[PDB]
Write a protein that binds this DNA or RNA. Structure first.
Length: 157
DNA sequence: TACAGATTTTATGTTTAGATCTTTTATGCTTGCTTTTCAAA
């Protein structure tokens, strides 16, 4: 598996072509390249770092269609194990959980979360009522209005 | 004015909460030396 081999050396072309497999814009891929170039000589398994960075970027870039459809979350992680030569899925989840704490406090990741409105999966208007202890926050019991509208369109079609 | 009772004043004892200083002991930095896994060939 690609998550096991150590001390690999990579080119910029491999990183920028692996970034375009998941449909990322140019500046996000450039920030992924720069985050790799900062920690170039102080790295053990670069494939894990690149995999988890392109993951944590493509949940943020594709959060709204993940809210539209949940199985895309099972589609991006299925595309990753079909490229990283890894049989199981839990290694990729532990990989992204491990690389998440390395970029959490940085300015570019904060600006990405601001610009694409991810904030660990929910809007600012929802997270400011969840942290305040507002009981009037939207609970995860009923479906959303857009989901009800597209379901009613599916019924009428 | 006048005296009985209530309250204040002054004085001392009892117990608790806490400060300050002193002494002995733990701990952390410094320097030198030796062990032991780690990225590279």
């Amino acid at each position: 598996s690609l998550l096991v081999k150590k001390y690999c050396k990579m080119t910029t072309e491999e990183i920028i072509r692996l970034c375009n497999d998941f449909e990322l814009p140019r500046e996000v891929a450039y920030k992924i390249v720069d985050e790799y170039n900062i920690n170039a000589s102080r790295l053990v398994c670069p494939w894990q770092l690149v995999c988890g960075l392109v993951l944590n970027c493509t949940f943020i870039v594709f959060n709204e269609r993940r809210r539209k459809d949940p199985r895309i979350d099972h589609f991006i992680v299925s595309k990753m194990c079909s490229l990283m030569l890894t049989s199981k899925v839990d290694d990729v989840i532990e990989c992204v959980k491990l690389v998440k704490e390395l970029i959490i406090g940085e300015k570019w990741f904060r600006d990405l979360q601001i610009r694409y409105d991810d904030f660990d999966g929910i809007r600012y208007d929802e997270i400011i009522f969840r942290k305040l202890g507002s009981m009037l926050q939207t609970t995860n019991i009923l479906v959303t209005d857009d989901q009800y509208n597209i379901w009613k369109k599916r019924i009428e079609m």
